[PDB]
């Protein structure tokens, strides 16, 4: 009934994090795995789109850490 909230999942790899927001499912698993996260720097300054995801719509952004 008022504004759905959106989360963020930040699918991680062994060498790569993809942080996505999503308001109505979660990125597809793919590449390793993903999980419900907070939101660092990289992951709301490199997250600025939009795109059509299984349940719902998610945009996502990636960034080098423990690679």
């Known amino acids: 009934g ?7 999942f930040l699918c991680y ?8 927001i999503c308001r109505g499912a ?6 390793g ?8 720097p990289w992951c709301r300054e490199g997250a600025v789109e939009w ?3 299984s349940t719902g719509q998610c945009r996502t952004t990636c960034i080098p850490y423990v690679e």
Request: net charge negative; charged share 15%; glycine share 0%.
């Open 2 to 8: 008022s504004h759905t909230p959106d989360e963020s």
């Open 13 to 20: 790899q062994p060498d790569q994090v993809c942080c996505f």
């Open 26 to 31: 979660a990125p597809l698993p793919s590449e």
């Open 33 to 40: 795995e993903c999980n419900p996260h907070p939101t660092a």
């Open 51 to 53: 795109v059509p995801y």
